[PDB]
Design a protein around this ligand. Structure first.
Ligand SMILES: *[C@@H]1C[C@H](O)[C@@H](CO)O1
Ligand SMILES: *[C@@H]1C[C@H](O)[C@@H](CO)O1
Ligand SMILES: *[C@@H]1C[C@H](O)[C@@H](CO)O1
Ligand SMILES: *[C@@H]1C[C@H](O)[C@@H](CO)O1
Ligand SMILES: *[C@@H]1C[C@H](O)[C@@H](CO)O1
Ligand SMILES: *[C@@H]1C[C@H](O)[C@@H](CO)O1
Lengths: 157, 157, 157, 157, 157, 157
């Protein structure tokens, strides 16, 4: 069984975001086409462990910001597949940017929406950058070795 | 003065967004390095003139969505400079995506933040995609013929 | 009127191709948004003036081939807009390649089909690389300063 | 033995094209450096099985066209190697475009010509996009783990 | 005459480099196809005016380094043409990098070699990234509106 | 254990360069995350074995130069990781170009400096293209499956 690495695109700034984050991670551990251990998770790769909620002294540090930004870009460009855990009502600008970078780097762009939200309107540009969009409960079984283009079964705004 | 064209990146979904939108457009009309008439303004380039507010049934039409998405991408790639009118508390996933695409296409990426909000925290990826971020009051006199790199003087998360 | 330069993509291997070629050139001379003199016309940019029809031995010369190929690529990348004069029944692999390169370089890609052939089936990949496809009779008045996305009103296979 | 995936670039619109197609597929199944099962074959990935010869009702359907186009691009960008089954006398515009896209995505571009046609003139732009060109009878044994640049032993026009 | 902007790629670390630098700048001022005032000259775009010769402590400052590096990249991407003043015996790794970036951004890449050195051996990768290489004495009259592909008439290693 | 391929970027034109070259190769053979046998080594892939020191007749051969240049670019684009064996006092223009190409192709860019030179100033553009820089003695143990962004512990000029 060949295995692909991913970039774990996800907000971590609300309760719905954090719930979906946790669900998506568990789904990935059970997916036999994913090498999760060699994958890139932003929250585990911030420069010196820093997040502006846990060590707010880095809110204005340009060195931390430069290295973390670069590391995230690096995590996209050196992994096979771009994943975007996506809350339709709580969309994230950072993920948006990362989606656009992933497109520029030739990566398959897969959005994953919680089952309870799948169908709800998403930003047109998110719909368009994405190659496919699936429900959280499909993620454990998604075959990342044969990723195909498909349309969201749901609305845009 | 040589003149450069832009893509008018800006949300239109809140009061703050619409205020900044109107301000940014007024600033641009007074900027002598901008050819606004040959610039691309999303809201004036809705596909086949059809207004999504008057006929919301087109938010399930994949052809409308495809053409509009492509027209936005086309508006970025065929113009000199990428402008992102940016509200720190009302960050937009669609703009984020567009910023990422603008980077991929080799464009100068300029964010403009209302003076009342300049300094407030912005997403790391926004900070990073940007080549510069300025206050609304600097936009009238920004020299688009000699755009340079600088950092936001403000917070990032 | 600001003016844009183009790369003159067109086959030259049949009667229909040569007719459309001549028509497209005439249309361009009357279009006030085109700087034709600073545009790149393959047939006027043969390497070191050497004419492949008069000396066919250069079709086994790798240096001639390298320089010409590079000059065409250079002609696409250094001009504003990619033009593809396109005959639906006499589709050209070389043009196809050039279209793909033009996309890669961030150029507006415009196909122009003779009015007598507009509507006839075209290759899916041609339909897709295009940002727009118009009839020969619309080329004189096409506004290259505000190029927009639209679909071919015609068949694809 | 490491294995690479490919995008199966080939016309399917003439008898020579179909013969070469079949030959190339059989060659690939016997090549131990190719993971054919995880590879992308256009004809097996058209949106809902549709081809305009078998279900001509999709000749004018923009949804089918959008998804199929995107799927083909996706098949190139997510696989290791770009293959072009190529008939010198029956060159294909769609393949041309795909070659150009493959170049833009950093892929090794290998043309394969039937032994009976190898040596015959090919379009200059095809010669140039390609990194290498081989005969059908070399394909079963080609080492895709060590792909190198080499010149066609044959003419261009 | 339409005018094009450039990025002034040139070492500044030896006598030969500084001589060629000064010569190339003088040549450019007399070239009527160049808008030198809206061009990007590294040495006139040092971050926040701070002079690295007067305050060498900034060569350990990551913020100074980041901003300057980005400003150079920005200077390449936002200008029409990439110029590389090139001394064959004093080749520069930084220029090499910039050449590679200019290629990636779709720019015409022109090397200019002092007449006294034209013909001397240059690095293969320099020969290859270049779209053309000319002598210092040809720079005043180079037509930047119709830049074409040609080979160095000289040695490569 | 997954394994990555590399492009062996290194000068071979001085004694320090050759020493570092040899050291880096030995380090790579002992690294269990590297598939060295499927990696690309310039010196083993020059067109027909030619190097202008061993067969100087190719100093002016454009065919040899074209194919070798293309082969090197191909070696970067088809391998996972870009390596640059780097002497701070003897920087190489060819490597510089290759670094810039590697960036354009989305590759992790790792510089390796001899332990005896680690800390010494490097060109700003080299510092900036690189994602990370390590000492020769770290190379045998570097985990290429989880490559991350980090700053050189050393100066730039
Ligand atoms: C980059 C990492 C994560 O996916 C988002 C947070 O906004 O940006
Ligand atoms: C595209 C246009 C505008 O800037 C945003 C809206 O979300 O995306
Ligand atoms: C390059 C120029 C022209 O448009 C075609 C001929 O096949 O390719
Ligand atoms: C895309 C698939 C196939 O290789 C060709 C047919 O023209 O286009
Ligand atoms: C960037 C500017 C100049 O052309 C060189 C110096 O090494 O790199
Ligand atoms: C390309 C191969 C090697 O890394 C350098 C020599 O200058 O250029």
């Amino acid at each position: 069984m060949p295995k692909k690495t991913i970039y774990f695109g996800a907000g971590w700034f609300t309760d719905r975001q954090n719930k979906a984050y946790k669900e998506a991670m568990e789904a990935l551990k059970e997916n036999p086409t994913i090498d999760l251990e060699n994958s890139y998770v932003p929250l585990d790769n911030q420069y010196k462990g820093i997040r502006v909620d846990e060590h707010p002294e880095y809110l204005h540090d340009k060195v931390w910001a430069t290295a973390t930004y670069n590391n995230d870009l690096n995590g996209i460009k050196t992994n096979d597949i771009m994943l975007g855990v996506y809350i339709p009502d709580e969309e994230d600008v950072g993920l948006g940017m990362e989606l656009g970078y992933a497109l520029s780097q030739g990566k398959y762009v897969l959005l994953v929406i919680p089952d309870e939200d799948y169908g709800k309107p998403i930003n047109l540009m998110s719909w368009g950058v994405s190659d496919n969009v699936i429900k959280m409960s499909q993620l454990k079984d998604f075959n990342f070795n044969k990723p195909r283009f498909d349309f969201y079964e749901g609305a845009v705004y």
